[model samples]
Target chain A: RNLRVLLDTAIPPSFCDTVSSVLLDDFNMVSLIRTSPADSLATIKQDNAEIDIAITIDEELKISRFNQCVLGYTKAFVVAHPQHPLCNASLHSIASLANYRQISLGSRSGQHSNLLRPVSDKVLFVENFDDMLRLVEAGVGWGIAPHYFVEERLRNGTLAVLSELYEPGGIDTKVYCYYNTALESERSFLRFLESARQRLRELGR
Target chain B: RNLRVLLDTAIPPSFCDTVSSVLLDDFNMVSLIRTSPADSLATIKQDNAEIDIAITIDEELKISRFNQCVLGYTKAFVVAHPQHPLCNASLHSIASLANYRQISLGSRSGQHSNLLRPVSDKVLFVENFDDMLRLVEAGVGWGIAPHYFVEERLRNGTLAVLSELYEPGGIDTKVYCYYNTALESERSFLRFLESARQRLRELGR
Candidate 1:
């Protein structure tokens, strides 16, 4: 048997890394594809599915619609290059941030959730986190990225977290392993997901 | 003025890093977007252009169709996780490689160029380099990537280059800056391209 997995683009690539590292004795092959949240939902709802499991955000689909398991939580951090003006400021605020560019994720046409909204009109929206990080590092603007994804950069000084003054609590969100109810009794796949969940939390920490 | 630049996804993110570092006083704003090679040509030929400059591979577009400037060359390296069997092998060949797995780039639907073709039927195709590298590093299989993009990994022992016995000479390819001929006399934009080319080569080295 082969397993097909659909991952949300917003989820970090490290999760996929974890999947690739796991031993899958029950299946001879496994394939993973990453797509937008909308596509992930659509693929799961359609018949003759191309995907067996969809690792999407908890909010993307109702739990009532699919069998699910909690994978892990990822936090968001406001980061910018060390040379960015925001990093040098004695104090920072939404207003002060508005003065500089904000490199955001997602298409410009999308109504950015309040968490991802631009601080100012001067914003460059990118399609993915990799580009968002590159643009942020280029000094184009400040950005909010998953903490686990940017932790190494922060430790290395390539990126710095904005002061806690920006938000009392940084964004923390849950991601879940979602699959069709028909797969509920697939012990091998379920066991694989359990192992993946374990690895995800380990690497995520 | 605002410059909208479309870049080929195969081009490394470091190029965008260089773009962000350059001072662009001539243009009030600059936006960078990465897309597949096919969409790049479609964007350049369309009316009421949204993109001002496109950085793509030399062979991706006809040089005669646009005003162009050479960026730099990127070399390919066959790499695998340190623990992969290929890294421990005493000898290697196309036949030996065909027995293992190869993680390739591009969609499964697209016919891979000879340079990127898989050694065996057991292959996993991914949409971008970041994912490909992650999969390779997870010990899933071996991969071919640009030398510049994986140099740090090689230096750090996270990834090891395959033995020279596999290929006598690695692949090297040139990249170019493409723009509408009408913008040829835009001295500021042209000057920026010259600076970008200089930075690209520096990073590639």
Candidate 2:
């Protein structure tokens, strides 16, 4: 069977690198498709997707759709540029950000969405984290992002972490792998799934 | 004066390269806000934006509020990956694309949108041209892209041109530079505008 795995652009690059190397190296020549996680799940559930597996975060899922795995967790943080009015405020809360513009990650499949909690009055939705950061740096909006992705910016003073970003405990998205039963019949699918799961474990650490 | 320039990500990188060299390069310090055209216009007109100049493509404009100049034309073409069901067909007109999942460069500001000429049934809007191509290459959707951006992809067989991907003669967008009247008084702004216009002429070649 042709080996093609699906994921979305918003997934961590390191994790993507890990997934691609594991699958592509195993067969020496396999295609990877990373688009919307909702589409990934819906297409697979309907038995219409040409994809073999899809890994997503925070997106809705149907446990009955495919063989699965719960790799670990990903935490998203609300962050702001140094010049944002709230950046240096002594008191910052979700309520304080209510009046300001917010940048968010939007979904193509409205059914499977990753909307930020405590929605702001004016919101702008972008496809991925990089663009979200770009908008913040441009001084147009504030947004949520994965910790690993923005640490350098946070440390270097380009961005500052918010006092209230996402839920108080942070958004701990459960990372998982979903595959069709058709792929479960293939030994290659099981091997690659093992590699993908192992990479997620590495990611959590 | 504070210097901020608003540009949409869908604008060609080459044109951006042109804009940056003309203005920011003079000072080695510049703030760029990449947003949808309508947002750019709305921000500037409402006086809520700190922006000084905005570069946009195919967005509605008001003759009363800003000083404007037509930079040049950018044409969009309908394209898809080689394996797409319509890849080999002699499609005529935008309606033919309605049946497939359409990939598009979406806007952050709904006011500045480039919906398919007649609109499509299913659509996926990414942030820019490269990602639009990435999704198309991944077999997720077909999309409209600036001709300059997709020439290589079309030449290499990675993507194919739809016979009538969009309107006949293509969607020729008149790229323009629109600046606030307050900026009209700045000598630096004038120099930069002249250079930006010159680059558009060069790009036309």
Candidate 3:
């Protein structure tokens, strides 16, 4: 039987495209099934479907680990309007942003919502980061974005830093490639998982 | 007597400093007070103190609304490692985020907590944005932050867009310069209040 992979919505668009391309073109996988986190969980639990692998992040682990270990820890940043009060604070804790409003990228069931559970009190959920940045530039609220989102803004002083205080511990929800332990016996699926892991390791380094 | 202003811990250090400077130097105000949001509210209500103004955001508008106006806006963002499966989908609603684990910023009394009230099932509260961002970077969970914090990451593709829900027409909370109406009749305080409004307008523009 060919391999089928189930994925959650938290994965970045670029990465998803890359992985899907690899699975379809290079590995000649049978199919790639994509679903919302809720649907994916339900399908995995109920259907006993042939889910060869599941890709997700570890919520407890920082994405930086994946960047460093899997995506190559390139420095990234958060951006906000230059005039925002928090643009200059030393980011030390999740609670620091409680005073300001937040712009989110995903729905309540998507990855952004899952990551925000720990500090829900300080956030204002939204639809996506593009709108989040636009709102920030318009001076609507603050945003928690990657360095790429505001490269120009940072240089222009249109956005500022609130803090650089990230807790230096292992965050568990970065990204993962999950498979049915039962499928470990399958050669193609096992090969794909191993290759994916190897690629992540190479990217991280 | 001089006008005194109080604020919560969630206020950014730079913004607070600017406010204090504006009040003391430009307005020739006598005193500026600072405290936690909870404490400040309690103090103002208990002693019927001669507080000239209170600077706070819209989420706490219910506390007291001597005067309400726009201070400015902040942007918040959500991010995950490229490898997370949920990152693939174009996330668009709170329901989507709920599917994954989340970390967010919080306060005893602030917008972050208020916004999340409607979607508590998917959120975990933390102390500030910095901690949440760290977790997001580490891949432990995705996070919601102000645009100021995550702009660069988003642009660089280190992080992707999750949602942007901050707008005048969208989910916006105004920052107001509030005072006890009863005390507004005081000569010095009244003058101070008017001057503060003028300053805020100037700064906002």
Candidate 4:
């Protein structure tokens, strides 16, 4: 049988490759289709494919707007430039960053863009955050980002923290694994997911 | 005197707006030229416009390849899906991600893409990790990313990890406070950098 999974582009290459290998080598499941995170979600919801399991960052998962069960968690981070004067202020208040140059992950209609629309007035839209960080370090501006991308830079002082912006109430993110429940039984996918979960837990420590 | 800064689109809206306000209100600096990160960097480097400072990410910073004295450091993060099969594997040895669909912050020619070229195959390039995470959570593909971008998802299980890939040793990145060194010596930049550094340290703990 074929198993199809959709994911985001920002996931580390190492992890994606590994999962693909495991699915192929161990489970002998054929990889069906892949696309951008936004596209994948739209496809899943649109086609309502009998998806076995789905994974995503909590923020993006919120877009699913589903009341699915929680699977597990991991760690992530943000990066910023230290030179900017506003680099030290807490990110809770909008007034703090009303004047700095802004860059965003997606266009106004995209998921992140829509998510950030409430604060759009205070920002200048850019193509992406990587560019934003590059510009920030180049003395152009500052940015908010996931920590993992810039951990190495953080250690070396290239990127700095403007604030520790966490998910509301300290909840990092919630990944969900869902199935047709009607057509597909949850044996193989569940087993694979559980095995994956155990492996992730061990890695976390 | 109005101070001009070049910036990219990836900078977060909140941070950009804050800095813009600070510059306009506190420093009275004017943003003279603005463009994408790639364009801005090329312009700044080519024109050598007495650029006072820049705020950007590690990848862009490396592109600049600034000298040691001109560099400073900041904090950021790298993240991945928890159940990412290869989170624990070595990056350099990843021959090919035959099974998993992949995504990246930039194209093969872009900074992050080039960085990962040695280890993995092609990147389904996107604007930023936010999009990547969206795709990942949707089960589109997996990618490498900074912590700030994906932390919320990581904690909630929307994302998983193969491993936290690090440069061989504890080599760190430097957020530079670079100037021409030949053209101008702006002590204010240094002062601003130190103040920002202190503030970041305080917030980190």
Candidate 5:
């Protein structure tokens, strides 16, 4: 069976790639492409479209051209270097960070990122996790990031949580897997989805 | 010898933190507080001052109040995840990035950071590197970052260098070692500076 999948960046690091790599080893021929969820859905509408599956985030998803299943969830935290002024003072309330610089995110969705988390007058807006970490590591300011992104540094004593923050409905929200009905009946595609589901259920938690 | 050093948010990653841990263990416990380079230098001015030295980037130091020495230098490069639109296109020239968003830094000095680089419009400004990396990795945009910050990811294939863009005379510009001349002759202080120099020179390159 043909297995070409569209992967969303929202999927946890290695989640889609790991599964795809294993399938490639078994099938001897498979494809993995990075794409936006909307673009991937449109591709599925074509007759015998080569793209068979897509991964995405959102509470609501496909029901017609696609068969869907829950992969898992994703979330983030507001954190700072331990030497940050807030950390030294053990400040917990949002107001305590009122005067501090907040490292924020920007969205391609035509809205300001980090709009969910309240912060002070100064804000540094970045596009990804790597930027946020280097700033916080340098003790330049604090930011909101997922455990997947900051866990290692947090454990190593470089970054510390100052507060909990998540994009509204972003935490524990189901990550969805979608496919054209015809593809689900294909054994290789079916097995890949099943494997991803099992691995994600354990891994995403 | 009792030691207190000033740190700048712009300092290379682990340049200050790594040294502190070693000293802490060797001295069986000591005071290691984080403060701005300016504030740390002030603590050095008072008689029998608590601060013995300050680590910094750039040239010269106070002649009467404190003396200084060269440690090493740090530099950064423009980079993005290989999957980014700009990267996928293999856009080699800066003009090719003109239409894309540029993740940039904002300075505490009341100006946007990285004024020296050639960039186009549609920018997301942040005060730190962590913000920059997350955005770039998410494919939001591209940015300039130091080797210490991006090397691991670059090695692992999560990030790719977009171009060489260090500030003018950026390399080997000398990270400075400033101390009350009083402390320069102290063996403990001398050893700490040497260890930091040896480690930083190796790690930075």
Candidate 6:
């Protein structure tokens, strides 16, 4: 059967690739729609949307109306380009970080409400993680990002975690899988998701 | 003076950094709002919007009410992940591309109207370039992108242009600077634009 999937923009690219590849094996056709985690939750609540599954991350996902599954957890880090002044600073205390601008994803009241709290009043909000990454790399400001999402850059020296000042794993996030229980045909899909959970857990470590 | 700049999401990240750094040299404070190219043009024409300047790319920009400056042009390429079958295909005609799904930025009648035409009806539309790039690199489908924006990836072999099947520079785009002439304080900004034009022209080449 053809299935429509609602994906959260906050989900890292590698996880997205894994999900899409797995979906292709079971479904005749897979349509993926990317939106913010909050929007994706609202979309599945609409009867007209006909969404088969929704993948997102949230602090409070126990509304109990839809079927929910916990995939795994990934760590978050406060990061900036290697050339940023904060990278070499002596102190990473909340007060020191508050002195510099912060780049955040989404409005303070939107997706970022569940993300790491902003320490700076001077925050630049971008709609997606890509723009946030670009700005941080441009030395505009520091931002919070998923560890797996920015692993390559952190390894290659283009980006660095502000770990000397703050602990790297302060914000560990649980990724969720949401779907309606009415779909009797979801057995195979759910089995695939269980396997994905194991893979995601490995990535989180 | 404090200025609010409405930037087209289509403008590459490097260009956005250049514009932001340049704006900081003249203004007391600068706020940047990123929107699609068409929306940026429409926003400047609104009375209630306090947008001081807008940077965008378009094909037919001669409406004439606002003062406009032409930045140098950049070429676009239809690209895919190196491992994608399309990268190794012997033929790249329209018909050949039409067989695969297309990952496009914006709605069909929106930002992509002035971009390279879509060769496939099976298209996935994303709100911004970042998501499109992610999907293309995931090998979900091929998408068109600015040459300078993806030059590093192309050079590193993670992505490749479909040059054997189609000409790489077929979709050359003209970047534009739009602002109201009533702002007499723009003399310094205009001079900066002239310098940026030279830099952008060099990047285009």
What shift in Å separates residue B31 of candidate 4 from its native position after superposition? 47
TM-score per candidate for chain A alone: 0.70, 0.75, 0.62, 0.68, 0.60, 0.75
Between candidates 1 and 6, name the one with more favorable lDDT.
6
Report the CAPRI category for model 3: incorrect
User: Regarding DockQ, does 1 or 3 come out ahead?
Assistant: 3
User: Could you give candidate 2's per-residue lDDT for residues B112-149 as a string of tens digits?
Assistant: 43332224668887666677889998889887777778
Give the per-residue lDDT of model 1 (tens digit) for A88-123. Answer: 532223335656788876633465433345656788
Model 6 lDDT per residue over B1-205, tens place: 6677877776777788777777776667888999865466767777788777778874333333455545544457778888877666332222356668998766434544333345577888786677888898899999877766678888888888874222223344556677555442446675556556656656656
- How well is each residue in B1-205 modelled by candidate 5, as lDDT tens digits? 4456666544665777666755664455466555433233444456665565566542332334466555655555678878876664221233356567888765334332122222657788775678889999999888766667887888899997755321111222235556665654456665666566667657766
lDDT of 2 by residue, A135-169 (tens): 99888988877777787898898987774322333
Candidate 6: count of backbone clashes, pairs at least 3 residues apart or interchain? 1
User: Candidate 5 on A29-86: residue-level lDDT in tens?
Assistant: 6777764332444455465666666776532322455655545456556688888877
Per-residue lDDT over A1-205 for candidate 3, one digit per residue giving the tens place of the 0 to 100 score: 5767766555555556556665664465467676643344445444457565566532222121111112211233445677776654432222345556766544444443244432324565555456678888887777665554566677887777653322111111335455554543445543454455455556556
Error of 6 at B155 (Å): 58
- By DockQ thresholds, what CAPRI class is model 5? incorrect
The TM-score of predicted model 4 comes to 0.41
User: Candidates 3 and 5: which is better by TM-score?
Assistant: 3
Each prediction's DockQ against the real complex: 0.01, 0.01, 0.02, 0.02, 0.01, 0.01
* Candidates sorted on lDDT, descending: 6, 1, 2, 5, 3, 4
Query: What 10-residue stretch in candidate 3 chain B is worst by lDDT?
Result: B164-173
Instruction: Report lDDT (Cα) of residue B177, candidate 3.
Output: 49
Error of 3 at B184 (Å): 2.4
Clashing pairs in 2: none
Scored by TM against the true chain B, the candidates give 0.70, 0.77, 0.62, 0.61, 0.58, 0.74
- C-alpha root-mean-square deviation, candidate 6: 20.6
| Per-candidate iRMSD | 21.6, 19.4, 17.0, 16.9, 21.1, 21.6
RMSD of candidates 1 onward, in order = 20.6, 19.7, 16.5, 19.2, 21.9, 20.6
Candidate 3 lDDT, B144-175, residue by residue in tens: 55554676777776775554321111222334
| Residue A6 in model 3: lDDT | 66
